[PDB]
Structures are given as structure tokens and as C-alpha cells.
Design a protein around this ligand. Structure first.
Ligand SMILES: OC[C@H]1O[C@@H](O[C@H]2[C@H](O)[C@@H](O)[C@@H](O)O[C@@H]2CO)[C@H](O)[C@@H](O)[C@H]1O
Ligand code: NA
Length: 601
């Protein structure tokens, strides 16, 4: 059908009563009105700012919106009160609407103290507003005491956005709202808060994870509940866990490297929430976030057709600033999206024709070659769409100087299809890891993936640490081996937690695993700290690990976050040694995220 994407601002900072608006929640009422909620922040801050929970209503499917109304009013005269960070939850069996939010007095989330007495100003309280009239009027309650089974949980907040009601299983009808808690150790954990009596009473489940933050849940085609979290430990990705007991408890937490994230809120929903258990439609999920590891920008919608196992489909909705976002399924088959563009709160509406996808996830393996060479790699399409595609094509996005081309056999319902990509890399290509994008194009929509082509770099998996002058292991993981794991977020760090640790120079040496012809080293600085950066350096090599040749290269690195090359005339070696002679501004320690060796495998 005709693609649809429209937006309109619902709140603009400085207009209609507040200098700052933040934190979106969106839902559709049983009668079909859309409700948008967000904080008004008179002093521009989260709790314990004297904030208010606001709401706008649309009775024409989102085309026009009503006046801004107060759900919960902050108070700037004694006694001070603030209400912040809304999450909507509709009980579709009773018609009741809930809006969860914090209730602050003296403390915000980090400063909250143990206790559950509503009158204690040093607790960050868990409140909920309830409406039995479609969100026209609200009653208010504090539920902290009901959802704090462990007295060491000193703080909590409901994750902003929208919670869910289970439709499947023995706990069908359960209302689930996610929280973050701070435990006695100071760790941030996720916990589902839920009601099996239509919101009359609430309790907490079992907490999960560490390094958690705002988190969301969604009911999968088979009833399991999938948890998708912001990572307060800042991996660059979303964290995921799954429950098979209706959100009471979850399994282990993993990093989902399909879902890059800059440590920011996000949303995940059923595309077809009324679909029956086990149906194809019941497996379809939509996800919204900032698709970036570094900045809150490049707002993207993703679609999965397999309960979140793969995300074949994606499309950018906001290339610029894009912070919190929340999705909801609309009665007309389209989707609403409430998000933060930097100026307040914006409402967008889109359909699946805009998203332009086909449910056909596909894989292409990573591959390594030398400059001057050609290689062919297999492509494997899993057609989840249920339809035949007679003329699929495969478009690749690689360096303009390379020759890359691909093809794929016709797609058949319920079948895998084969294809291939051929890559030719010209002589003289700079050694490096090159990410290549691939798009499966069809008249019924497109799917995408990426793969990495490594050109003229040795295999880190065959390498080991031959020696190192100093490494921290007591207070953090700064093992030397962290330079050869392929992961820019793990680093070697020299010893720092003892006073008598050495300063510069520092030194790390690699065993390449065998003799190779090599001609360079590439250094990557530690990504999240500035004061352990290598500056002046020398490189040496060896055939035996004891007698060193060089310096074969010398120089001074910059503060660039990207790999930096140090090159030297091609030579045979089994071992390579980096001597870090100084730090950029004279500090005592060295840290290195990654070392790669330019050479022939
Ligand atoms: O002392 C070396 C370690 O410093 C840690 O950072 C310190 C920071 O320099 C100091 O200003 C402070 O307030 O606490 C920080 C601890 O998080 C680095 O994180 C660590 O890796 C070492 O470099
Ligand atoms: Na690393």
C-alpha cells in the first residue's frame, strides 16, 4: 500500500507552561483515543525536580490533539513534591488505564534511601495513577511498600513508555510494568512489577542482571516474555533476557549485538498484538531506538519476524537528534511513535509499507584476504515471508574501488535460498577491517545485513601475549590479552592499584603463532578514558622472542579513537613488540584497546 510517515510536535520547550518537556509515554484507550504523556519540568531536571505528569488526547486517530492536561501536579511550596517519568498500561479486559511515575520529595533515583513509608521524604516513591474513565480523571496511589520485597532495594523507577498485558498462558491477563531498582551493593537491576487482579494489587518479581537500567518487556508468540534493557555499563548495545513464568523471573542477561544503543531508552512491541499464539503474525516485533553506539541520533525502526531472534528489516525515522522513543499499535493498522527530537515531544505515525521490509533474514560470513585477491562467499536467505520471489537481487555497499557483486536464487515459501557474493580488492588497499553492507531487494520489500572483509591483517585468534611490563587485574580487567580479542571495549591497562606500579616506558609483545611476513601495526586507544593514551612509541620484532630487532618503526600516536598505523619495510617475524615511551599528557599508565598486525596470513 501507499507508504505513510507523518510527524507533529506535541510539546515544545518554553511553550504552554514549562521550559522543558521530556520522557514520552503513549497508548491507545479502549475507545480508540490516543493518549500521549510526558513530564513538564519547571527547573529542567529529573527527580527531585518539582515536576508534573502531563497528558494530551487525540480523538481523531492522531491527526489533532487536545489541550495539555495535568495527570499529577508537582508542588513548589512546602511540602515539595515532584512526579516524573510516565509509563502507560491499559487493562484491555477491564478498560482501566494506569500511568506509573515516580513521586519525589527530597531525593532523586541515585540519592534515594531505604524505606517505604510514603511520608519519608528521602525515599523515591513508586506511584501509579488509575483512570476508569479513559484517562479523563485519575486517582493516585503509592505502591512502594508493595513492590520492595528486599529491604536493601533503596531506590526504584518504572521504565518510561508503555507496559503490557499478557494474552497467553496460565498468567493470561497479568499486567506487567518494568522497573529499575538499586540494591544494597549499589547495582542497577531490572525487575517486573505485576498484577494478576486487574491492578488492585501489585508486587515485584525476582530482580535480574547487573548494569541494567530502563527496560521493556514483550510477550512472544509462545508466551515467553522477552526483556530488552538499556545497559548502564555502556556496552554500546541492548541487553536481553527471557522469562518462561510470565515475567516473574528471567534467565541470564546477554548483550544483543544486533541492537546497537548509546545508553538510552527504547521500545519493543508486538506488531499484531491480537494474533493467536504460535501464528506467523504473533512472531512479528517492532523495535525503536537510537541506532548508534555513541550518540542519541539515527532513530531507527527495526522489525523481526521470528520473536526477536533476527532483525532483517530497518529504516531510519530520524537521522538527527533522537533520545527516548515509544511505539504503540493503532486500531487502523498503523503505528504511533512518540519521541524526543531535542525540542520537546514529537508524535510520528507510520505504516509497514513505509518500513518497506521483507521477512527474509540472511547471512554472509566474514572473510579475510590479501590486497590483490578475489574471493567468493556464500549467502544464505531464510525466507520467513510465506511468499515466492522470482527475481530477488543483492546490492552491496563496499569501497568504490573494490569490485563487489552478488546474486541470490529465487525465494520459495518456507525455504532457504542460496546466493553468493564475489569480492575483488585492488593491490595497495590499506589493511583494515571493512564493514560491507548487503541489501536483499525484492518487489515485496528489502532486508539487510553486514559482514566484515579483513584485508591484509593477521589472524588475532592465532596470536598470544609473549610478554608485558605491567597489567592491572586486581581492580579491573586490564589483561594484556585484551588487545587481541577483537573487541574495542576491552583493553590492556598497566598496573594502577598499587602505589609502586611502574610509569613509562611500558611494553607489550605478541606471539603471532608462526612466522609471517609483516609490515605494520595498528593501535586503537582505550575508548572511554583519555589519560592512558600512548604517545611516543617504538616497534621491534623477533624470530625467537628473545633477541629483538629495531626500532623498525617509531613515531607519536594522536588522540584519534580510530585505528592508527605504524608501518615498516616488510620483514619476517614470529613476534612483534610495542614500546610505549610516553603518555599524551604525562600520566603514569598505558591502556590499549586493540593491536592488529599488517601482514600476510
Ligand atoms: O587511577 C587509575 C584509574 O583511574 C580510573 O579513573 C578514576 C579517575 O581518574 C579519578 O579522577 C576518579 O574520580 O575515579 C575514577 C574511577 O572510576 C580509571 O577508570 C581506571 O581504569 C584507571 O585508569
Ligand atoms: Na580489546
Amino acid at each position: 500500500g501507499e507508504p505513510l510517515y507523518t510527524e507533529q510536535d506535541l510539546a515544545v520547550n518554553g511553550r504552554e507552561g514549562f521550559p522543558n518537556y521530556r520522557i514520552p509515554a503513549l497508548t491507545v484507550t479502549p475507545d480508540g483515543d490516543l493518549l500521549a504523556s510526558y513530564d513538564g519540568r519547571p527547573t529542567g531536571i529529573g527527580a527531585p525536580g518539582p515536576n508534573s505528569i502531563l497528558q494530551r488526547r487525540s480523538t481523531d486517530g492522531g491527526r489533532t490533539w487536545g489541550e495539555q492536561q495535568v495527570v499529577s501536579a508537582g508542588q513548589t511550596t512546602a511540602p515539595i513534591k515532584g512526579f516524573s517519568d510516565p509509563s502507560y498500561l491499559v487493562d484491555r479486559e477491564t478498560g482501566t488505564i494506569f500511568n506509573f511515575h515516580v513521586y519525589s520529595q527530597r531525593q532523586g533515583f541515585a540519592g534515594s534511601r531505604p524505606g517505604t513509608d510514603p511520608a519519608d521524604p528521602n525515599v523515591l516513591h513508586a506511584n501509579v495513577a488509575t483512570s476508569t474513565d479513559g484517562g479523563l480523571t485519575w486517582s493516585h496511589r503509592t505502591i512502594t511498600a508493595d513492590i520492595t520485597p528486599d529491604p536493601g532495594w533503596r531506590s526504584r523507577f518504572a521504565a518510561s513508555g508503555e507496559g503490557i498485558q499478557l494474552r497467553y498462558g496460565p498468567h493470561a491477563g497479568r499486567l506487567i510494568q518494568q522497573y529499575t531498582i538499586i540494591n544494597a551493593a549499589g547495582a542497577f537491576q531490572a525487575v517486573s512489577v505485576y498484577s494478576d487482579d486487574h491492578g488492585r494489587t501489585w508486587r515485584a518479581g525476582e530482580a535480574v542482571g547487573v548494569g541494567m537500567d530502563e527496560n521493556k518487556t514483550v510477550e512472544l508468540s509462545d508466551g515467553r516474555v522477552l526483556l530488552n534493557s538499556r545497559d548502564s555499563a555502556r556496552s554500546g548495545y541492548r541487553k536481553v533476557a527471557v522469562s518462561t513464568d510470565g515475567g516473574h523471573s528471567y534467565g541470564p542477561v546477554t548483550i544483543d549485538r544486533d541492537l546497537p544503543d548509546p545508553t538510552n531508552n527504547a521500545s519493543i512491541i508486538r506488531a499484531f498484538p491480537d494474533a493467536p499464539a504460535g501464528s506467523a503474525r504473533a512472531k512479528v516485533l517492532l523495535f525503536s531506538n537510537a541506532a548508534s553506539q555513541t550518540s542519541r541520533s539515527q532513530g531507527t525502526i527495526r522489525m523481526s519476524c521470528d520473536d526477536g531472534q533476527t532483525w532483517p528489516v530497518s529504516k531510519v525515522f530520524q537521522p538527527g537528534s533522537m533520545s527516548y522513543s515509544t511505539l504503540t499499535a493503532l486500531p487502523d493498522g498503523t503505528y504511533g511513535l512518540l519521541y524526543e527530537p531535542g525540542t520537546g515531544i514529537r508524535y510520528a505515525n507510520f505504516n509497514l509499507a513505509w518500513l518497506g521490509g521483507i521477512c527474509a533474514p540472511f547471512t554472509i560470513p566474514d572473510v579475510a584476504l590479501e590486497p590483490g585477491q578475489q574471493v567468493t562467499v556464500p549467502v544464505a536467505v531464510t525466507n520467513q515471508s510465506g511468499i515466492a520471489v522470482p527475481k530477488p537481487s543483492l546490492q552491496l555497499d563496499a569501497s568504490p574501488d573494490w569490485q563487489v557483486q552478488g546474486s541470490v536464487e529465487p525465494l520459495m515459501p518456507g525455504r532457504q535460498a542460496k546466493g553468493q557474493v564475489t569480492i575483488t580488492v585492488p593491490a595497495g588497499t590499506t589493511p583494515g577491517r571493512y564493514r560491507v553492507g548487503a541489501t536483499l531487494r525484492t518487489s515485496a520489500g528489502n532486508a539487510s545485513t553486514t559482514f566484515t572483509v579483513t584485508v591484509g591483517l593477521l589472524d588475532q585468534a592465532r596470536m598470544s601475549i609473549a610478554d608485558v611490563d605491567s597489567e592491572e587485574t586486581a581492580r579491573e580487567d586490564g589483561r594484556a590479552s585484551n588487545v587481541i580479542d577483537g573487541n574495542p571495549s576491552t583493553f590492556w591497562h598497566t598496573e594502577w592499584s598499587r602505589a609502586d606500579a611502574p610509569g613509562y616506558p611500558h611494553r607489550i609483545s605478541l606471539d603471532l603463532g608462526g612466522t609471517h611476513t609483516i609490515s605494520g601495526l595498528q593501535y586503537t586507544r582505550r575508548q572511554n578514558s583519555a589519560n592512558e593514551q600512548v604517545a611516543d612509541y617504538e616497534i621491534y620484532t623477533s624470530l625467537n622472542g628473545t633477541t629483538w630487532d629495531g626500532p623498525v618503526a617509531s613515531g607519536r600516536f594522536t588522540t584519534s579513537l580510530a585505528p592508527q598505523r605504524a608501518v615498516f619495510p616488510a620483514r619476517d617475524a614470529r613476534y612483534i613488540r610495542l614500546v610505549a615511551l610516553s603518555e599524551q599528557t604525562g600520566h603514569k599508565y598505558a591502556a590499549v584497546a586493540e593491536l592488529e598486525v599488517e601482514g600476510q596470513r
